[PDB]
């Protein structure tokens, strides 16, 4: 996360972190239930083996509330491809269930029609993660969040040097130096409605981070709500 703020205690409890063979975080996820994590399909190609940590806010400090869970099943969208970055979505089933507690709680899945008419039409959404603090920078040891404006699709297409499919949406700022970045990939974009947070996106890709004339690109979760339900059985 470039700009934004450190996420306050208890305010980003659906954040998950995928942890690789160097023991380092390399992507985020979103807690959907005791057994299921939402992430980006492209994150699966960045580590051969990984686990999921929840309830962490500071990767250099053992708070006592953190837990690491092994992955039992990976459910990658069958239409994802690295050539298009389309369908950039996967669900993980964990070997052992999460115990919800301080800093560990699931985000809501919204009903599709209402999400389109009511969530996607909000001024802003919230993205979070432990990713880099500027484009060429290092990852944050502390969990950050950022309010990012929704950006209209026509503007999104014009700004992009790559094809924006209907399974993608832009959020963020034209020139203001605030954005997600590498390391946040796979993590939550949620939209607030009357003090309840609903999953609306997955951090997917960008041409750099916080570049002028470029936006953050997110997996459009509305397009995959039935797919997530089926993946979660």
């Amino acid at each position: 996360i470039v700009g934004g703020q450190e996420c306050k205690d208890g305010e980003c409890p659906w954040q998950a972190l995928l942890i690789n063979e160097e023991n380092e975080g390399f992507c985020g996820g979103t807690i959907l239930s005791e057994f299921y994590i939402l992430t980006a399909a492209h994150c699966l190609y960045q580590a051969k083996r990984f686990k999921v940590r929840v309830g962490d806010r500071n990767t250099e400090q053992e708070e006592g509330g953190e837990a690491v869970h092994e992955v039992e099943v990976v459910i990658k969208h069958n239409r994802f491809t690295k050539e298009t970055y389309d369908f950039d979505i996967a669900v993980l089933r964990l070997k052992t269930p999460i115990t919800f507690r301080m800093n560990v709680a699931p985000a809501c899945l919204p009903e599709r029609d209402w999400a389109e008419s009511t969530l996607m039409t909000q001024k802003t959404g919230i993205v979070s993660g432990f990713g880099r603090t500027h484009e060429k920078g290092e990852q944050s040891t502390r969990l950050k969040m950022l309010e990012v404006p929704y950006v209209d699709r026509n503007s999104c297409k014009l700004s992009s040097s790559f094809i924006i499919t209907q399974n993608m949406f832009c959020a963020g700022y034209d020139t203001k130096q605030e954005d997600a970045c590498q390391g946040d990939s796979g993590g939550p974009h949620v939209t607030r409605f009357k003090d309840t947070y609903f999953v609306t996106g997955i951090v997917s890709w960008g041409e750099g981070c916080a570049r002028k004339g470029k936006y953050g690109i997110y997996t459009k979760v509305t397009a995959f709500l039935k797919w997530i339900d089926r993946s979660m059985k």
Binding site: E11, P13, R101, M102, V104, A105, C108, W114, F193, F198
Partner: protein, 54 residues
């Protein structure tokens, strides 16, 4: 009522069904008797920040 005005007074999901507004809630919540509010059924319902230490 219309869902386009104050979300049909619904806490969460609103739909206009048989030409009439019906509210509903995510899993982990039960729709209240007043047919508008969403009541958590557990201490960690989806989409709530964990602000009260238990």
């Amino acid at each position: 009522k219309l869902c386009s005005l104050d979300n049909g007074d619904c806490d969460q999901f609103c739909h206009e069904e048989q030409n009439s507004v019906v509210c509903s809630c995510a899993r982990g919540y039960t729709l209240a008797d007043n047919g508008k509010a969403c009541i958590p059924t557990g201490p960690y319902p989806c989409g709530k920040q964990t602000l009260e230490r238990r």
